């Protein structure tokens, strides 16, 4: 029997699902949540052996250990141990579409564990084993005897071993199959791995036991009063003296309690549940749970004799909160949420899909520290501890079924098929039964990218039926189907309609007001953070803030799915699709996070932090108006820091305590500001600082900022009179300019400044030349394969237009001598195949002061695709340690992604000026720069620039950051103009029109000089 | 057209139908009936089964049908006759004028039933007028009510033909047998004969 | 595998359900509803033998007729031929309530049919067998070969025998279980056959 090829069979002998248990035999321990003697981890070293197929597994293995087996850690993904390659496929199934069949060649991991059990366990009650995560299906044997089977890689599979075990030494044998019929339901956009990847354990329950419990909180009109209802079920002989006591604690204070014998109310003609009972506990002025104030209580469920003897106790944390959609708004505790979310897979660059607390905690804190308040379990129920952490630190969670059939044709091929309803239902039901008591979980989701089938409808109703406390959403088939309480599209744009057939993605603002539509809209995915991305992020926020029913969304996504590999000399590097011989593959498309796999942030994180700020500011004269977007807490750990500077030079500064009630306002008037008579721009910057530490942040933490330009005093003063007057020396091939120790040289054949010297030091390795292209961003590439070309992608368009290959054609080059200067005038034509793409016209004006002033005017053919940038570039001979500038920063910032950055005086190590995106592209840009200083060089004007040891060409030819090599000297890219980077999606052009270089005529000017 | 699902003997009645583990088996009993009979014009209403209390399985299956075949109303009497798994108030044995206020699953008078606050559905009895033996007394009363109230749209009498079986005596003569006649026990004796006609189709 | 005690298994290898087909190869006949050559009845005389439990059934049966069997009409209810007794219970299940388990003593009707098929059937196309109603669960074998399993006493259970059939003489062996996990969903107020 090939059960792994029968969606009709998803388990055998498996126990029913339930909420997390520990069988504590001491109430006190349960209360304190101390560890339970009844719950043992079998995590650690296990025996493992790999086979190409299950038929290759040796019968002996069941009775005895294979000498050839190795000793490995569990949990783990075998690919992480090197047994076989991890595969990175997106939509396309990693195996042949032939449901419910799987390949004959099906990697099989045979696991085994030798262990002991004490008689105690054995002499009375129940001994069961729990496999938190097994990928994708598996058979289990104990002491040579087969126990059962299980499917669904993302939920615990449980079996009773009571009758398999013997005092002392026991042996587990787990035959784990890489693929199965459950795989047709596990087509998520991630690495395809396998193994015993989540905890293994053993739990002891008494014969008379708590088999299930449901915790509910209902409130009065103003939440000033609550009723906690606890439904408790038992297994065991039914007896009159049996009782249940449910007690509620706030810290060490017991706030409520109730006890009762089993026997629920009459429910139908045949009676009620004699094995159940419901406790109702009244709670006055309960402390409510939210992500802003994760207040929790402890619920302790005791199963005991009337007369006092405790049989066992189970327990959980409880968050009193109400989730509800009313009049088109998702409310929490009666207030409308504004979701600052992120999608997050369970990914680890070293361990793969194994999740540890450390990592979890870390993810949580960065998210909180970055203004996120919610997370989506893309696209499967997560490791148990995750929910507990969310409960405690405070995050809103979308709990999602492990059901993704994206590779099908059409997408709802299985979900619309009744024959698959059973396997699907279990993916939904068991999730619910497991996580229904976590307050963090506020919405249930039916899975992902599985089209829309009758099955979804059934399942949707099932949930609503069993747990009315939470809304249910699902994006499949159009995002606004009958199977979802929220309009939850992926990648719908703010203002821009994408009217695909059957499943259009309307402008989010238009979507809300479609006739008959009334639901709230929360994007299940938006702002694809792939590489140099997140352009247009603020646009979403502004809309979320203006329209009440736009209650936010979940960014796609949290961390890059990169895996660490090693080179010939044991140095580690970041790998993506195909880097393991895996094919077909989807290359870098598994890398779309705000942070790198090691959790180091991408520059975009900051953009996200800013836009998601919880405090809003307006300036009027010297009064700042602070508005609070907190729904529940007052600004009780916040201070306002302000500062005024003139061109980077600090004039004044102060700090003000924030005292803003949620949704409230606070006006802050600044002291008269000092008056400088000195020319330039005064800038005001404000930062909200958290004086004290929290469980998720260090004291001094900065949570919000904003900047404004105050007065400006135009410099009317005249530069100082120059003693010298530079000299020009002509030759047929060049024009040379000389002033003191400085000289410039311009090639007459090419029309460029080809050399500059300080003293006798040349300053350039490559001539200063115009630049209209960039090493393409992932967003510029979109899908566009080389086997498969997408003609509408930017890169493709640029490529086809010859942008990357046009050659400069000199139209003119001349020299004039001024009163106080030499003037070089040039003109070039950029053509491709007889087409004039661009025209550049310049003048170089060097005066007796040694300042070279470059004025540039370009023309762009209206019928050529809008160029990536309009600037100049050159390779400097020099390599300096720092880069100092007067403009936006300090981090990388692009035109459509620069709100977070601040204008000021920045000074970093050269290296911070490069963004080590794993898939290399244009990066490190800084906008709104008025002054840039490198080594003895200094540039002035109003531009954007980048500077690194890497040319655009290298960047463009290398696909892995580890393969980059510093070139001689430093490449400088100075732009008068730079195209937006986009990112509404990473597979169609996404740069908004306002950020495209379509004006046709461009002008800029810079002053190059020394210091 | 009614799904093959009846869990009458459970305690409480919805013990299985409300358990997700039984959703799969149950699902097939409905889905498969629909796939088979859906082109039949005579079938005008789908039933989720009989006497299985009211469980979440019912709701999901209810929805599966609505979704798959919107051409026909779906009914189910279990758990009260007016739950969320039924488009028609379809009680068994509710009386005309007399209320029988059973706990949890009362059988209101049908006329009163229709007008309960917020109730708007049509009401058609899945079973009424138990024709067991010398019976059918008060039949007219239903008819008068069905005729006067628009939303009282009729019902299905219980039931058509006596479930008696032929047995032969020593002298090989036949005779109608019922519960217990075959050594069968426990048994419900004459309870299997509630028809308007005898087993051989001769009318009562 | 005691598939009849696992509500997780309600069939094995069963084809998908669908409306009544006849596979006509002529439009006029389909229109007029005439009988169709592609659809053939196996009702008639079959061979039968009664056992008290699935375990009492001998393997011989799979390969060959059981001398002890009788020739009976099909379709039929074995309680009507005297093999065992019909049961009349209303609410209380006819078996002990302990889902998904059934009694160890569980009456088994071993049915069999020797028959032939047109060669052309063998040649090309698909040949499936359709059982309109089997109470309550059954295992099916063709020419010794195990074909599949089915539950739900009131809907047709269909199997492809394209691969099991053979030139001329074929033998079907149907092992039918009185009780099954299906019985828990079949508690209707009527005779239990
Ligand atoms: C939304 O799309 C992103 C694109 O990278 C991933 O494929 C997610 O799984 C999908 F739900
Ligand atoms: C309605 O009750 C009658 C009583 O004879 C029958 O038992 C039916 O099966 C039930 F639906
Ligand atoms: Mg299977
Ligand atoms: Mg997908
Ligand atoms: Mg079964
Ligand atoms: Mg009944
Ligand atoms: Na909003
Ligand atoms: Na992706
Ligand atoms: Na590249
Ligand atoms: Na009427
Ligand atoms: Na009856």
């Amino acid at each position: 029997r090939r059960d792994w090829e029968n969606p009709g069979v998803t388990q055998l002998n498996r126990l029913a699902a339930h909420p997390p248990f520990a069988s504590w035999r001491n109430s006190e321990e349960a209360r304190t949540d101390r560890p339970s003697q009844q719950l043992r981890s079998l995590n650690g070293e296990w025996r493992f052996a790999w086979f190409p197929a299950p038929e290759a597994v040796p019968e002996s293995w069941l009775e005895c250990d294979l000498p050839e087996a190795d000793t490995v850690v569990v949990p783990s993904n075998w690919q992480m141990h090197g047994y076989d390659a991890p595969i990175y496929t997106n939509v396309t199934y990693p195996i042949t579409v032939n449901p419910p069949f799987v390949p004959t060649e099906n990697p099989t991991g045979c696991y085994s564990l030798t262990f002991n059990v004490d008689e105690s366990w054995l002499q009375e009650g129940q001994t069961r084993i729990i496999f938190d995560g097994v990928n994708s299906a598996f058979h289990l044997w104990c002491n040579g005897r087969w126990v059962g089977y299980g499917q669904d890689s993302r939920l615990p599979s449980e079996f009773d071993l009571s009758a398999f075990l013997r005092a002392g030494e026991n042996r587990l044998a787990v035959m784990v199959l890489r693929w199965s019929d459950g795989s047709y339901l596990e087509d998520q956009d991630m690495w395809r791995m396998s193994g015993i990847f989540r905890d293994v354990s053993l739990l002891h329950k008494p014969t008379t036991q708590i088999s299930d419990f449901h915790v509910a909180t209902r409130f009065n009109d103003d939440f000033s009063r609550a009723v906690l209802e606890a439904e408790v079920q038992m297994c065991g002989e039914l007896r009159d003296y049996l009782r249940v006591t449910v007690s509620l604690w706030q810290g060490e204070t017991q706030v409520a309690s109730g006890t009762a014998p089993f026997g629920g109310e009459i429910i139908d003609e045949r009676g009620g549940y004699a094995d159940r009972v419901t406790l109702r506990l009244n709670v006055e002025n309960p402390k409510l749970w939210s992500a802003e104030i994760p207040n929790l209580y402890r619920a302790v469920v005791e199963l005991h004799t009337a007369d006092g003897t405790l049989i066992e106790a189970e327990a959980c944390d409880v968050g009193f909160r109400e989730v509800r959609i009313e009049n088109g708004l998702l409310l929490l505790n009666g207030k409308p949420l504004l979701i600052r979310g992120v999608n997050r897979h369970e990914h680890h660059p070293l361990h793969g899909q194994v999740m540890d607390e450390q990592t979890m905690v870390q993810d949580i804190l960065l998210m909180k520290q970055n203004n996120f308040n919610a997370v989506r379990c893309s696209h499967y129920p997560n490791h148990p501890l995750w929910y507990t952490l969310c409960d405690r630190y405070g995050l809103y969670v979308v709990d999602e079924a492990n059901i993704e059939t994206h590779g099908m044709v059409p997408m709802n091929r299985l979900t619309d098929d009744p024959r698959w309803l059973p396997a699907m239902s279990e993916r939904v039901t068991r999730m619910v039964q497991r996580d229904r008591n976590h307050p963090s979980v506020i919405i249930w989701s039916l899975g992902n990218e599985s089209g829309h089938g009758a099955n979804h409808d059934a399942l949707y109703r099932w949930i609503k039926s069993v747990d009315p406390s939470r809304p249910v959403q699902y994006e499949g088939g159009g995002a606004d189907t009958t199977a979802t309480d929220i309009i939850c599209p992926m990648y719908a744009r703010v203002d821009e309609d994408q009217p695909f057939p059957a499943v259009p993605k309307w402008s989010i603002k238009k979507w809300l007001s479609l006739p008959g539509e009334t639901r709230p809209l929360i994007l299940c995915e938006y702002a694809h953070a792939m590489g140099n991305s997140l352009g247009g992020f603020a646009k979403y926020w502004q809309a979320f803030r203006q329209y009440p029913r736009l209650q936010g969304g979940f960014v796609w996504d949290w961390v890059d799915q990169s895996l660490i590999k090693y080179d010939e000399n044991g140095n580690p590097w970041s790998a993506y699709g195909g880097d393991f011989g895996d094919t077909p593959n989807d290359r870098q498309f598994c890398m779309n996070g705000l942070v790198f796999a090691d959790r180091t942030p991408h520059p975009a994180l900051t953009e996200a932090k800013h836009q998601q700020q919880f405090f809003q500011f307006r300036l009027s004269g010297q009064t700042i108006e602070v508005t609070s977007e907190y729904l529940f807490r007052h600004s009780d750990n916040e201070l306002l820091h302000w500062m005024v500077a003139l061109d980077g030079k600090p004039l004044a500064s102060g700090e003000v305590p924030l005292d803003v009630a949620p949704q409230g306002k606070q006006l802050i008037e600044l002291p008269e500001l000092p008056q400088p008579e000195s020319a330039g721009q005064l800038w005001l910057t404000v930062r909200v600082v958290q004086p004290n530490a929290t469980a998720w942040s260090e004291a001094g933490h900065i949570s919000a900022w904003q900047q404004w330009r105050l007065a400006e005093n135009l410099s009317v003063t005249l530069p100082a009179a120059s003693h010298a007057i530079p000299h020009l020396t002509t030759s047929e091939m060049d024009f040379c300019i000389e002033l003191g120790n400085k000289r410039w040289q311009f090639n007459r054949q090419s029309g460029f400044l080809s050399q500059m010297w300080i003293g006798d030091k040349k300053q350039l390795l490559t001539p200063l030349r115009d630049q209209f292209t960039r090493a393409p961003l992932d967003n510029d590439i979109g899908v566009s394969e080389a086997t498969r070309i997408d003609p509408n992608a930017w890169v493709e368009r640029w490529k086809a237009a010859g942008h990357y290959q046009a050659e400069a054609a000199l139209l003119q080059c001349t020299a004039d001598t001024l009163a106080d200067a030499v003037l070089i005038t040039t003109a070039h034509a950029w053509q491709h195949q007889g087409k004039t793409l661009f025209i550049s016209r310049k003048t170089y004006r060097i005066d007796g002061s040694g300042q070279m002033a470059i004025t540039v005017d370009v023309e762009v053919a209206s019928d050529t695709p809008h160029p990536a940038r309009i600037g100049l570039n050159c390779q400097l001979a020099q390599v300096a340690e720092r880069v100092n500038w007067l403009g936006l920063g300090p981090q990388e910032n692009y035109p459509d992604r620069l709100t977070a950055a601040c204008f000021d005086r920045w000074d970093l190590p050269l290296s911070d000026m490069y963004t080590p995106y794993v898939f290399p592209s244009e990066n490190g840009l800084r906008c709104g720069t008025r002054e840039l200083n490198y080594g003895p060089h200094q540039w002035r004007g109003d531009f954007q620039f980048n500077i690194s040891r890497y040319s655009q060409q290298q960047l463009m030819e290398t696909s892995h950051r580890h393969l980059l090599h510093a070139e001689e000297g430093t490449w400088l890219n100075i732009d008068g103009f730079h195209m937006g980077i986009g990112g509404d999606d990473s597979w169609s052009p996404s740069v908004s029109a306002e950020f495209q270089l379509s004006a046709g005529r461009y002008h800029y000017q810079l002053v190059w000089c020394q210091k």
Side-chain angles (χ1 to χ4, degrees), chain A residues 713-726:
Chain A
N713 291 307
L714 292 188
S715 228
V716 282
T717 34
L718 292 97
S722 43
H723 351 73
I725 157 27

PDB file of all heavy atoms in Angstrom, chain A residues 713-726:
ATOM      1  N   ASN A 713      17.910  81.253   3.485  1.00  0.00           N
ATOM      2  CA  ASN A 713      18.460  82.534   3.100  1.00  0.00           C
ATOM      3  C   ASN A 713      19.366  82.393   1.880  1.00  0.00           C
ATOM      4  O   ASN A 713      20.485  81.870   1.976  1.00  0.00           O
ATOM      5  CB  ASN A 713      19.076  83.249   4.308  1.00  0.00           C
ATOM      6  CG  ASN A 713      17.982  83.669   5.278  1.00  0.00           C
ATOM      7  OD1 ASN A 713      16.989  84.345   4.913  1.00  0.00           O
ATOM      8  ND2 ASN A 713      18.139  83.221   6.519  1.00  0.00           N
ATOM      9  N   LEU A 714      18.829  82.815   0.720  1.00  0.00           N
ATOM     10  CA  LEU A 714      19.550  82.725  -0.550  1.00  0.00           C
ATOM     11  C   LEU A 714      20.872  83.485  -0.472  1.00  0.00           C
ATOM     12  O   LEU A 714      20.870  84.647  -0.102  1.00  0.00           O
ATOM     13  CB  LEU A 714      18.709  83.162  -1.808  1.00  0.00           C
ATOM     14  CG  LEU A 714      17.531  82.234  -2.183  1.00  0.00           C
ATOM     15  CD1 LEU A 714      16.868  82.596  -3.517  1.00  0.00           C
ATOM     16  CD2 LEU A 714      17.957  80.763  -2.224  1.00  0.00           C
ATOM     17  N   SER A 715      21.999  82.844  -0.818  1.00  0.00           N
ATOM     18  CA  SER A 715      23.301  83.502  -0.820  1.00  0.00           C
ATOM     19  C   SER A 715      23.358  84.438  -1.995  1.00  0.00           C
ATOM     20  O   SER A 715      23.225  83.983  -3.152  1.00  0.00           O
ATOM     21  CB  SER A 715      24.507  82.610  -0.989  1.00  0.00           C
ATOM     22  OG  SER A 715      25.418  82.997   0.023  1.00  0.00           O
ATOM     23  N   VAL A 716      23.535  85.716  -1.632  1.00  0.00           N
ATOM     24  CA  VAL A 716      23.626  86.779  -2.609  1.00  0.00           C
ATOM     25  C   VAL A 716      25.036  87.302  -2.656  1.00  0.00           C
ATOM     26  O   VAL A 716      25.393  88.173  -3.439  1.00  0.00           O
ATOM     27  CB  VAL A 716      22.718  87.899  -2.216  1.00  0.00           C
ATOM     28  CG1 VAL A 716      21.343  87.414  -2.617  1.00  0.00           C
ATOM     29  CG2 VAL A 716      22.862  88.021  -0.707  1.00  0.00           C
ATOM     30  N   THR A 717      25.851  86.767  -1.791  1.00  0.00           N
ATOM     31  CA  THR A 717      27.201  87.240  -1.807  1.00  0.00           C
ATOM     32  C   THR A 717      28.017  86.692  -2.979  1.00  0.00           C
ATOM     33  O   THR A 717      27.786  85.597  -3.501  1.00  0.00           O
ATOM     34  CB  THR A 717      27.814  87.129  -0.415  1.00  0.00           C
ATOM     35  OG1 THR A 717      27.244  85.976   0.178  1.00  0.00           O
ATOM     36  CG2 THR A 717      27.378  88.372   0.369  1.00  0.00           C
ATOM     37  N   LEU A 718      28.965  87.504  -3.427  1.00  0.00           N
ATOM     38  CA  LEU A 718      29.803  87.131  -4.542  1.00  0.00           C
ATOM     39  C   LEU A 718      31.104  86.412  -4.148  1.00  0.00           C
ATOM     40  O   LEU A 718      31.845  86.831  -3.244  1.00  0.00           O
ATOM     41  CB  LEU A 718      30.028  88.356  -5.446  1.00  0.00           C
ATOM     42  CG  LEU A 718      28.773  88.826  -6.188  1.00  0.00           C
ATOM     43  CD1 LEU A 718      28.087  89.977  -5.443  1.00  0.00           C
ATOM     44  CD2 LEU A 718      29.154  89.251  -7.610  1.00  0.00           C
ATOM     45  N   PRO A 719      31.384  85.300  -4.842  1.00  0.00           N
ATOM     46  CA  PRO A 719      32.596  84.555  -4.561  1.00  0.00           C
ATOM     47  C   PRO A 719      33.775  85.507  -4.503  1.00  0.00           C
ATOM     48  O   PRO A 719      33.700  86.628  -5.008  1.00  0.00           O
ATOM     49  CB  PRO A 719      32.770  83.541  -5.708  1.00  0.00           C
ATOM     50  CG  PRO A 719      31.493  83.561  -6.540  1.00  0.00           C
ATOM     51  CD  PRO A 719      30.691  84.759  -6.056  1.00  0.00           C
ATOM     52  N   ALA A 720      34.870  85.070  -3.891  1.00  0.00           N
ATOM     53  CA  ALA A 720      36.045  85.936  -3.792  1.00  0.00           C
ATOM     54  C   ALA A 720      36.946  85.958  -5.044  1.00  0.00           C
ATOM     55  O   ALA A 720      37.193  84.897  -5.638  1.00  0.00           O
ATOM     56  CB  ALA A 720      36.824  85.600  -2.532  1.00  0.00           C
ATOM     57  N   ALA A 721      37.442  87.163  -5.423  1.00  0.00           N
ATOM     58  CA  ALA A 721      38.307  87.394  -6.594  1.00  0.00           C
ATOM     59  C   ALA A 721      39.643  86.670  -6.649  1.00  0.00           C
ATOM     60  O   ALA A 721      40.521  86.820  -5.790  1.00  0.00           O
ATOM     61  CB  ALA A 721      38.464  88.847  -6.999  1.00  0.00           C
ATOM     62  N   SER A 722      39.719  85.907  -7.742  1.00  0.00           N
ATOM     63  CA  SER A 722      40.799  85.037  -8.153  1.00  0.00           C
ATOM     64  C   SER A 722      41.976  85.774  -8.743  1.00  0.00           C
ATOM     65  O   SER A 722      41.898  86.568  -9.667  1.00  0.00           O
ATOM     66  CB  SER A 722      40.330  83.916  -9.077  1.00  0.00           C
ATOM     67  OG  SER A 722      39.407  84.385 -10.059  1.00  0.00           O
ATOM     68  N   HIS A 723      43.093  85.463  -8.149  1.00  0.00           N
ATOM     69  CA  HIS A 723      44.387  85.983  -8.501  1.00  0.00           C
ATOM     70  C   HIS A 723      44.734  85.448  -9.904  1.00  0.00           C
ATOM     71  O   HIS A 723      44.839  86.215 -10.868  1.00  0.00           O
ATOM     72  CB  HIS A 723      45.327  85.538  -7.341  1.00  0.00           C
ATOM     73  CG  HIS A 723      44.489  84.949  -6.218  1.00  0.00           C
ATOM     74  ND1 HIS A 723      43.872  83.687  -6.322  1.00  0.00           N
ATOM     75  CD2 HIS A 723      44.111  85.474  -5.009  1.00  0.00           C
ATOM     76  CE1 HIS A 723      43.169  83.480  -5.201  1.00  0.00           C
ATOM     77  NE2 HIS A 723      43.294  84.536  -4.389  1.00  0.00           N
ATOM     78  N   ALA A 724      44.844  84.121 -10.033  1.00  0.00           N
ATOM     79  CA  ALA A 724      45.167  83.492 -11.296  1.00  0.00           C
ATOM     80  C   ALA A 724      44.123  83.607 -12.388  1.00  0.00           C
ATOM     81  O   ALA A 724      43.047  84.206 -12.301  1.00  0.00           O
ATOM     82  CB  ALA A 724      45.402  82.017 -11.069  1.00  0.00           C
ATOM     83  N   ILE A 725      44.515  82.962 -13.462  1.00  0.00           N
ATOM     84  CA  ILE A 725      43.743  82.800 -14.674  1.00  0.00           C
ATOM     85  C   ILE A 725      44.407  81.581 -15.306  1.00  0.00           C
ATOM     86  O   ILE A 725      45.631  81.604 -15.503  1.00  0.00           O
ATOM     87  CB  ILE A 725      43.491  84.086 -15.487  1.00  0.00           C
ATOM     88  CG1 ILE A 725      43.190  83.939 -16.980  1.00  0.00           C
ATOM     89  CG2 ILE A 725      44.536  85.166 -15.248  1.00  0.00           C
ATOM     90  CD1 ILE A 725      42.539  82.625 -17.408  1.00  0.00           C
ATOM     91  N   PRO A 726      43.647  80.480 -15.486  1.00  0.00           N
ATOM     92  CA  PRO A 726      44.236  79.257 -16.000  1.00  0.00           C
ATOM     93  C   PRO A 726      44.697  79.420 -17.444  1.00  0.00           C
ATOM     94  O   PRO A 726      44.263  80.356 -18.143  1.00  0.00           O
ATOM     95  CB  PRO A 726      43.166  78.172 -15.865  1.00  0.00           C
ATOM     96  CG  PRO A 726      41.850  78.918 -15.829  1.00  0.00           C
ATOM     97  CD  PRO A 726      42.170  80.340 -15.402  1.00  0.00           C
TER      98      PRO A 726
END
